[model samples]
Target: QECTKFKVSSCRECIESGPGCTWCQKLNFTGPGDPDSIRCDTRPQLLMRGCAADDIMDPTSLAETQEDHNGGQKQLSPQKVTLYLRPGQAAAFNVTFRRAKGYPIDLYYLMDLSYSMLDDLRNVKKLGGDLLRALNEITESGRIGFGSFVDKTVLPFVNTHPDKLRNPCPNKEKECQPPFAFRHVLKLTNNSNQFQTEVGKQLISGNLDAPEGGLDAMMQVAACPEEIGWRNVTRLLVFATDDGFHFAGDGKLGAILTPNDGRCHLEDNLYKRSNEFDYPSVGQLAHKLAENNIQPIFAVTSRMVKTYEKLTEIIPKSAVGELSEDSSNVVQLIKNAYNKLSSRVFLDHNALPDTLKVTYDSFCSNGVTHRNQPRGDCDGVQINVPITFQVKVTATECIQEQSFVIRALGFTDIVTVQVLPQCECRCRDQSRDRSLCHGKGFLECGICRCDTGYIGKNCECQTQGRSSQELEGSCRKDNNSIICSGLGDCVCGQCLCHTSDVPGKLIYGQYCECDTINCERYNGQVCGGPGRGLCFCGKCRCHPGFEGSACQCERTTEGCLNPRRVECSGRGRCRCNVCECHSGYQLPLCQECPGCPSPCGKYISCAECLKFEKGPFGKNCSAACPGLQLSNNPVKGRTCKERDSEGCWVAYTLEQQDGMDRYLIYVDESRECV
Candidate 1:
């Protein structure tokens, strides 16, 4: 039997079974011959051995690797990756780095040695020792180098007089060296004494023009890696000058029309093409510095601080400081610039294939997270604070095999990513027949894979028993008559109401039973009638004194009145609570009255009744009055008269024996009596 085949009889035996098993020695420890001496697969077993729970590695933490089998150079651990992904698929990885505690440094000083900078030159002579000491606080292994520049030596840039050619500063007051474009002063070395010796020996040179060829010298210092002796470490190029720099177009003024070729045109440590080449442009110089991983620290006088500040914007990873009048702050300026440069971190990547899209998310040292910063610029990073980046790559379409690089902005070490897109199916060993899935599911990797919303060995059953009948049953009301109130479909055991298609008909409800018709309703309910009535299923049940679909009409008997204010005059009923008169009666109330009598029918004449009694105009009449008569005779036969002697008209009252009431009147104009 194999060693693994033996039953673990003790804690030691289980532990010796390797990473897959653990031993429990806390309570179940018995003699070696006992059958229950060891236990495996539980975390408590390892806990008894004094191993912390967090110290155990999870199964998912196991790392995987793919070697480059095509005779390519092998990469270090955690630095190489190979991915196999399908279109629209994504792969994620981590790029980790520990803060460099005592990183090595390489610094090169590129100075302008023009006549005006004579005092600044003397100040730098004493900087070699102090600068190295200051840098030691940040880096134990630091090296320094030096280079210098002046304006181009041409007809317009220089005097060109034979005597002045030999001595460019012909003024007796200013003793200076002959004109030159640039010179290589010293290569990088760790010996501070050697740096001081070399820089001290440099003489102050004179330029015919005020703007020196600083950009030209900067380009050479960056491009000529061999001549400057730059190391693969933190590189700093300090440019100290008293005036602004002359760039490419300025060379035309000097009639030196040939553009600087971004190459080392030096012979015997001096610029040999000072009279032939023009100054390098700012863009060209910026590109060279970035390519060589050199950070420029501009230490210009206060008058040119703004000028150098603008240059820093064009050159990535560069800083500018106000240079003291005497260059006394050069060492401190370099120290501060280095600190600023290393404190911030930025991420970058090489060009990727068209089918691949890459995005980065950073967990910065300040405990804040930033997303989708393609520029990858991070600020205020502390020393020894680690930053982690999560890189996600998505494949838009199928692509061939290729590789790309990812690294920090100023770092040379990179993470190499090789992609192998899975363009076609690679399941050659998978069973093609349905037999593997019992004739119901697809076969993938020798196993059964079910379809959507299906389960079981053959994809034979629906998920959650969600059938049409079951869904419909759920949507039915408690009475189980209509599904979704006949308003919407029953889907997956839930009711989804249908909305009204017409404008202003915003229908929505759990059972799809309501619409715009139910809104702006009275009585805090749908479609309440105008008289505070209720609406049920689109019809109004009106309250008393009101009747209509919306109860909008009033049924009060306010206008149904006679002169006595009696409704319908007690002769008819009221419909909709309004008056309705009976036969032979008229609105607003009913009344009965006789027709006018003939002229001779009664003691009171028709004209007399109309004029004096006015009896029963609408319904009933009063009792008749005694008759009266007017006569021409006075005080005889019951004559009635006006009793005025001058008039013939007279009135009289007579008593009739036949129990009739009559009135006799005489008119003066007609002279008649009745």
Candidate 2:
């Protein structure tokens, strides 16, 4: 029931589907009507739906193993490896090495027997006992072998006259032997007496050319593994001559135009194709020696030291020694060259396919990292000082099955790696049922391909019925025109919030309308303060009894009272200990009154009554009044009168005024009152 409806269109899709779903390719059911064709979500559910476990297909299967083929050494971890990879995929493994001390040695002496080396030949005859004793200082076991070469016996390389062909130095005093290209005189053996006897029997051979066929003989010794008796030990090949050597293209002078084929041409211990093939080039000899793990030592007289020194520059794991004219220093030269050759360790590999790339990171014994150097070159290494290499091989392009080898220079043991590229999916071989999709979709690699405007595993859902505009309409907020507030996509009537490219900036919500900054704030902090309340869609949703712009105001009336203990005088509300006044009310408690009518009447009549009676004023007259005096007070109730009959008469007496008694004076002739 948890499986969501989706389209399974390819092997990738079938493998990436949710864990419960399994791909069944046997029936090829693509639509809902087919009982056995739909993808099953569970094992029990699949059985109930009439599909077995064998019908399920796994498209992406991987296998890897570290094979052990090195016999008798079970402790060497990862001697071989096999991997299964898809195209453009890569895997890595580790390789380690420890120095094998006191390893055995195999030394082969390839000498130039051209007439110039007559005295050197005699010197080498006595060197067997001395060389063996000296090499024992480095390795407990050592063996020696010998071979010789001269220029080819053909026209220009040799005189070619019947007399000279028999003996190249026809001049009687020279005592020269017939010219020969190369001859293997001995194989590796511990018998020093036999070595000396064979070397002493060698006679001086003559050649027409000054550059002897030393490289030709060197190539034969390196390539003829069976004849030369090369063993899986520290191999050494010494090329000693009095003059420089010849290489490819030099044989053209003798009418021999074919290049050396880099193969052994020895027949009965002698190079049979001397006149037919050219001498091996410096590069050819270097590669052949490396492939055979042969460390070469170039021993030449002082006159040719510079030339052999240059030769050493071209060949890796090679050394150049100065050979004295009398060859008295030959034994010391061999011993010194052996020491130098065995001191350093190097790595080499075969030519890899173009699609593959190999890299090596070396950790030297001195604890320094030489990561920038090319793979397999570690200079100035010491004996018994372990060096580790981290070798990494990557397949850049799809390639067929192949293997590569890695080994220490001049040593035999190697680590082989086999590669297998995963160029295809396994589901391609599953059952073919084009009708599995109900003819509405194509079936490939155990998956379906639905047509345009259709979706679902069987391509039965009609997705074209609902337009994108209609789906977007359902994602819009009530007041916002932009769907999902422009923060996400509108899909299937819901908002899927977009994840920001910047880390930790994911915007997710029901409407995609909330973010880190858009929520309600508390105490000048966002989201109603930490742990208080959250801001949902730009509105503050605070906890109970907490309300304000920032949700910091508490709902309590602890300090909202005046001296009378009345709350805003029952006229206003209190917020944050301060009253918010209502209409027609003032601050601080709303206790003061307003404007009303006055009680006093006219002022002039009241002032006359006060002057005549000299009495306190009241609402109505109740007490008697006192008379006003002319100059001083007269008797009580007495009145003042002026001449009666004269021009004007005046009298003053107490009288009623506004219902209050007052003093008054009357005049006989005029009825004027004050």
Candidate 3:
């Protein structure tokens, strides 16, 4: 808890003399401005880890020269010295430990409820005590809260039919709720009863595709402060899901062209065909989450740890913990998550000067790593400086929850960053008082604020932004200014330009003027024209994959002069200047292969050796068998070869007495010969 430790004193010693030597003839406190005058005066200065002021032989006040010691105690200055007042000097000091109270902690729980999570639901009923216990261990007084979520509300994410609105259970004996994304299960409450009640009533839902709307749910959990019931302290969002996330734009495969406006896609508890839209993109979701100051904790299985890692990288104050197979470790997982969230200290620089620089050398790790600026002169710093910094945490084993004192020393100031995992960010829009909704969207100036894409000031807008025009004519040569100032294109009484890649793709304003929209698209693509289109003055209304003025060019497609080259070999889709194959086929020309028999499943279509398959009538046909399971016996010259072995070489097999048919696999050695 103690972030800084330093000594202070009012003492005067002989010029350049060792510390604590008041009797030294050269020592004198000066008040009348005399060179040798010493009349009870004290001056304080910092003494680092290795340097000692006593090493000076006859040290006087810092204003006096050290040479006055006359080589007396000066030689002993190498030894460390304690700071204290001289017998004749009068001084007082108070130890100040800078500590702040009432930290702002906002927490939301975004959960997943598929058929596989039925058991975890039971564990959640008993998890309150464990969660509370964990929180108690982290802080003396901190709040803990709860929230829940499921996959999409439509088929693929959920069944779109009206019958399955409340539940997706295929069996008539079972009942379920309609497929839906993030749902406000409970407001952040200190009462443990609320958490138990909501979690107890939660039932699993179904998803149509392998990738669920987990990311979408996470965005809502972070964005909608009122929904999850957040506290005004450190915000922590716990995302518990057993499946991988369904990223935005995945609905293109099903021909669902509209974008998800982040509103409830369910109509009458059922996801409609027209309501079906693309998944929430990672960039859009991450941007919205960070801006809301919500720390997302991913409680996912080890099978999808990589996905968790990638998600955590973008969400601030977020972390990922491995979930055990049996759900027995759910409590422990949540506990560890609380601890990790309370201890993390991070800094993100949005836009730093190119001339400014910083470096983060983590001395705590016994080493350092460079934190270089991507395009600016700024750098980063972690808690590893000489100044002592730490978080005072308390955990409650009973509830498996935590709270803590987040304290750190910044340069010369000691800062206390509190860790409150139970508070939530509440939107004032729902209030009957319209004035309360003035700026109630995300958090800004200690109140909920909204970004530009969100309308109605309270961020209650449920529709996406429209695409406008694109840049047309070049800048006027006489004026030497780019067409539309290189912002938007000059069209027939209108300027048409590209729309942003961010979701809710809003174009320019009434006159087609551009301003800062979303921040996630600042990576590398928008360099030249309009420099990210942030300053453009044109909005284009183009097709799904088209942008620019007149919708003349497809953002990802190219115009082909020869229709023969445009056909995409009848097996793939042609976009821009390239060919994109379906799951089982691949080829820029796409004229070679038929459907390959994929054995692993839809997730992974091809194994190592079976990645390439020649068509039956093609000149490159090998005819042995494509995408088939291989035995470990090494086909001597064929399957035993290093290439195929690198892929599907199964070396051993075993037979079960009751088995219809199956083979056991061994990797290290070949058991087929035995």
Candidate 4:
């Protein structure tokens, strides 16, 4: 009971109380709120920790509003691209090149031929030279092929009658064969004369319905790539028509038994559903073309340009061109189409994974904007972008000839996607460790590299060292220092330390003391370990709340949390766990970027000051005016003198203006004054 003597107001009353209450009364408190009550609450109040500008200044405040005032310009420019094909990846069909060193061009001329395409066909021949020019741009070798299509083979597209089937060319004098989708008119040839001769022989076929068997022709073009003369080099398929396609099962009017298998029509090979078969769906067409390395280009007369253009968006590498009523510029249209095709940029990968996104930033003269980017990796070698390049595989001779389509719709003005390798590789492999999978670039398999004093299949275990009895027993003597210097634990005979009071992770030695400074050559902060506490080479093991290796540096520019020191000269507030500038000061660190839109001291100009006088406002200056130029005063003329304050020169002026109000101006020339 005597221990209570120290708890009372005068030390005498505490002698009457118990041990715990004795110290309480001595703290000048009789009870909880009594005048002499010395209260000590065991329960602590909840504390909300973080930066508050009113509380402290830090570097983090400077970075907050930077992105908003990005200055002068906003976006980036657009990029240019060129297109070409890889060698060895065979086309599905066979093609021939009549010109020397010229790769065959698989031209699938899908004409409406339904009376509406007569003028278009007439104008198409004139553009042959333009087509040749376009092909030459894509590849030195040039071979041109041609294919024609009419409407459906049913009653609307053809009379089906034996007599009508043999002569549907309407010109009575001309002879025709049964209605068919692709006539395989001419294999790829460089001889312009042969191409012109074959194109001239084509005669228009009338159809009952406005829509044509364009889908059937397209299917044939995609399926019979070998039949056409496509080269191992660039493969191009041109679809020219005047109207929308009648597509698929729509050809059920006639008594044809089987339907179009989305490919060849059995009955007459002219309509999509000549024998109750299904037409090729959009997905089917896209897949076949991608597989065949064929790029489909659509050339429609001006009237149907909008409609065809819309369709191309869903397809890749496909372009829609507007044709003249006379079709006289068919050559130019073809050339432009090929030119556009040649200039397009494509991702030349084997196959892209879904996780990969491909995005492109365009650097045009004005600024940068995004363009046609894919959402994910492509199924195979995709050319969805406008950039151009080529893909080459070995064995060009064995490659098949083929034709396919590429489509595009001018939307958003930009496209961006990440070209990732197919997800077949481990998606979570951060450490790529497979020797066999080495040459695949980013597709290499992942493997983990364990840190020193750590080991395990996943590098999840601590190495053998600190846990040994030689260091363990003495560790607890220094307040468990041997375990992790009070920062970590001895796991698997080594120190598996906990995060320090700093920002980054740091590992101490068996005694848990930072020994990073002992290294011979180091770039950043380093935490001490076993041995001389020196870094393995030049690498630093940064401490908590610190980065680099020398441990001399702090963490991110955001500054420390609840730091005892002020980092921003007390000119900002903390928000979002960071410091932000107050009123006059505007910078991440509140130091000042200087010379922004509106800075201090322009009109009344007093930005600089003498060494001794340092204030936030323009009040800091010498007591006496140095260059006193008194224009008018009650006394004698003002005398000016030079004044130097701590190695800096200062001058002052007194001028009477039109307002009759006298003003004083100060000028400091020394650069150190500011």
Candidate 5:
């Protein structure tokens, strides 16, 4: 079939004829008597024919490199692209991602200054050089920052008595600094030596409660980018704590009514609004941290592991690690967390419509290709080894000018996409009086765009004085029914069925209800893969031996027929060549009955003809009845003793042998029938 099967109309019909199809817009491509199918085919297919190049209007999706990597700053290449798609079309292409060596990074160490963490504080005082030494292996341009937190000094959170304020520690052996909300000890700098001296100056502090105001401090560390000297780099906030944290609404115990405004409250490196603002909620802190591309690494003691691990779940791209009692592993913890975070490259996007879907296929250095994921994240990715992602964006519905951005999570570089589902043909010619459209429509692309109040293939019919309700009613298969079963347009009283995506498959019927592709299936295959049957309309028309809704069942009674000349011995039904017996009966032609009479009484007349030849057989006794043998002694198998017409006992047994018609008949002569 050709595009003319769709219509002798326009480019819209041509594109809808089949997939990967285009239209030839060259003037006079179809003369007065020419078949319109010649003007519609694949791009190369139509060009091989009479249609010339560029005259074929095919959907084109564009990709243009917006920007490249700025050394290590921009990791994903070709930051922008423009794509086009039509209905049920997919625009696919490849993009590369490489995390280059010497990429810059910012590591901020936010510590808990509670009295319980005093031992941990001393351990981190010597961590700067080792931390930078480990980070240097990953990147040459690495920086460090320092900050600390305790609880609010208000009563119930901290012992506010003047005696306790001076020394919050219970022990007299060592004194503690006055507990405050937070402190920005040092800004980000390349010099690891400065971090050590800065940490040595930080004093141990104590709070009345066990939980610290870590959320408040974490919020300040992320919000005040200027205060911490943050830049557009891989930023990490390593939160080291020995205890759990107090979050939002816990501040009410201290009678702090104001909420924590996520902003800079540092006055001369001190939290000036420590008691004035309430604590930040875990959710609020998570949102704030992710917004700034900051990945928090929780280094915690055994007591605080579960608490911080749960918090990490709330925050995106965060990690947790078990720390020694003295926080001796903070350096290694930061290094490992940074490696885990940086190893993942998120090829995620934004502003995609609900009607569209974007899938990713990743070809990584590990020689494994991960196919068809919602987005690409090639973990275990190494530096300078580029991973290729085959991104495919498919449009299930239609429209124009859909723009979005493809951003690598936690990275600065981005790609912008402008999707154009180009359906506009933009052409025409109109002959007013003697036009083929009969003066009621414009003939464009050799077809008519029918004017209002007129309808037809050539707009030759006018619909004057016809109500909209009446015209719609003519479309319905029944009253208030969907027009053409929603598969095709109802022009006049005839339903014009739509073309199928498959060229050979067709949709037809008076109501546009019949389709070759939509029939029921057997074994997940249509009509058992055309071997057992064929799909007719919406049902499966089975072959000679097969039947069922989907031709899944065999049609046979071969094994169900009994030797008694009846199917299921007239007791049960037959199914798939097997006898399905009724209640109180067994299979094999329903002949076996347990704990019940065995066909004895029914064959008594035959036994009478054999044992008592004086009754019915006359002289042809042996000729009329066969296999009836008279035994001198009693028989053992299924015996039946009965008193016949002359009050004489008749003994016999019906035992079938070979088949139903053949039997081993036994009758006792001792019970002589008179």
Candidate 6:
């Protein structure tokens, strides 16, 4: 991650320091004693120190490669390719496929010829020519081959009597072949007459068990590709059966202790080793067909269809079709199965390393695309039509030279890939000189990186004693504080601030004091919503009318005055346009003084006149106070007293709810004379 970590000296060395490393070859770079390793720095540092982009050596930065394969004979293009990449870098290329028109087809009929399937065996014989004709229409050139299976010729699976070993038929009246596992009746050929003759010659064979050795025969047929005449083209194995199949572990009953080698042990076209080897497991047989790229069509009676249908789910590129009571629909069944297998295609890669990730996107004929999907289908695929899929192979972690194979299920054509693992640069190599930086430093890039005990711009001054940390101590405002507040580097006893990632923003000062984006906010916005103020160092510089730590408070002071036209009733202060009244005063203009005289004394005589009509103004109390009403009954307020004109003390309760000149007073009924 850091160029200096590599300890590279020349431009070539710096370029190969993976990525982000740059080499400077300027004439005046470095001081006389500076090491050659100082010529290398990251691109940012080199550029900041006035190094021209043209003078920087970073070959890996522009490194890339891709080759197109526009011509090929197979269904998939660029049948093979090699890619070169570095760690954290990628190469993208397209793999195209267009099914070839008139591609040849090879169909081999593998039949279960146990006596119980005699009817189905006979039907296959009749349709041998019919099958060839239909396939030739779909594909111009087609070949046909045949094989047959009954059961292993052993004690538990077959009768050991000499007479029955020769002819194991349950019904002696009908001639049947002796028990055997599988026999190759014919090799593939385009001749219809030969195909028909071979099918007719296949006679029903008999065995002791109900389940035939079908799985054993299928495994041999798939493993021995060359013997069955597979031509690296579309291969089809039509398996016609009327009974169930005996699989792995069943052979133990017959004393066959060894497992099926899954190899061809045929002697003169017959599976002579079937009696010696145990049957193969279904999963073992599934992978054989997949590796061989052979699609098998199971032509089974309705009674056995369910078993084979389940078989189709585990095995790739296989299907099931129901046979009539006698398999008379064998030809039609095969045609349908072939079309079904051809109409859709599945794509996947072989075993991939753990560090790599591969994704697929299909651009089918219908213009639909599935993202991040390695699974897709094209229901309308036809011969010679191009259906494309994109595979982006990326390395999640650095990997060395490796390869993997990509394939279309059931198709023999595959794409082979070779990875050219990460990191190779083309930086030009050059040497630096110590003469450029006087006698104390070496020239590196375009400036001088002075050595220990040396100082000054060109290493022109020699220090008595100084180390990197000792010089850095001078960069901090306080000796105990962090150097540059951890935001910048200390160079030449000075703080060099780092540039911010946000554009149109900056960080600068003597001590790396500020990062614009990190400043205080007002109303949840930086600098009082962008225009009212701005941050300088750690404080806000408000506009003319705005002030405060975050620019949140305005300079205006209209909040101090109250309804009494006084500011805190001359008893408090106004700051930030708000009132702060004294200890005994109320907020919001404290004009009310509870220690003063009550207004009830001024209206006591009026209260007496209204109640008894014996004070001055007599019954004219209502005329003198137009808005007043009698409250001779005790009113709901504080009571007070004063001296009336007769030097008599009068007491009354004033109703504050009534306005001035509209007083409703309650005078004490009893009078006290002095």
- Given candidate 5, what's the lDDT at residue 450? 80
Clashing pairs counted in every model? 11, 12, 112, 103, 1, 12
On the 0 to 100 scale, the lDDT of residue 109 in model 3 is: 55
lDDT tens digits by residue: candidate 6, 1-674: 45432325345545544445677766556543333445678888878877778877654412222334554446676666676654433455566667666568888877878766776666557666666668767677777788888778887777877887777777653777777778888887778887777677757777777877788888888777566557767677878777788889998898777997878867588887887788888788656777787777887887788788778666766777886878777778766875767776777778787666666777777666655556446666767678776666655334678888887777666677777665443432124556645767764444555677665556655655333756565467687788777776756555557777785366654456665555678777777766666665556666544678777675544567654346665466666666665554455565443554656544655655666566545446666555266654667455666756575676666654311244456666767676
Off by over 4 Å in 3: 1-106, 162-167, 226-229, 253-278, 313-316, 338-344, 352-670
lDDT of 1 by residue, 367-477 (tens): 678775454456666466666766666654456778887756666666676777543322323356665445656743222346666543334444554346554554565
Candidates 2 and 5 compared by TM-score, better number: 5
Q: Could you report the Cα RMSD, in angstroms, for every candidate shown?
A: 40.2, 45.2, 25.7, 28.6, 23.3, 31.2
- Order candidates by TM-score, high to low: 5, 6, 2, 1, 3, 4
**Candidate 2 displacement at residue 247 in angstroms:** 1.5
Q: Which ten residues in a row have the lowest lDDT in candidate 5?
A: 1-10
How would you encode candidate 2's per-residue C-alpha lDDT over 76-115 as one tens digit per residue?
A: 2357756554432335555555554666778887777766
What are the TM-scores, per candidate, against the unseen true structure?
0.51, 0.54, 0.42, 0.39, 0.61, 0.57
* Residue 54, candidate 1: C-alpha displacement in angstroms: 34
Quality of model 2 by C-alpha lDDT: 0.60
How big is the RMSD of model 3? 25.7
Segments in model 6 whose C-alpha atoms lie over 4 Å from true places: 1-71, 88-90, 159-163, 225-228, 375-377, 428-674
lDDT of candidate model 5 versus the reference: 0.68
Tell me how far the alpha carbon of residue 408 in candidate 1 is from the true structure, in angstroms, after superposition. 2.2
- Relative to the unseen true structure, what is the C-alpha lDDT of residue 85 in candidate 3, on a scale of 0 to 100? 22
TM-score for candidate 2, please give it: 0.54
- Which residue segments of model 5 deviate by more than 4 Å? 1-74, 135-138, 159-163, 249-261, 274-278, 306-316, 351-355, 426-434, 465-674
- Name model 1 segments beyond 4 Å from true: 1-77, 88-90, 173-175, 252-258, 353-356, 428-674
On the 0 to 100 scale, the lDDT of residue 426 in model 6 is 42
Tell me how far the alpha carbon of residue 520 in candidate 1 is from the true structure, in angstroms, after superposition: 44
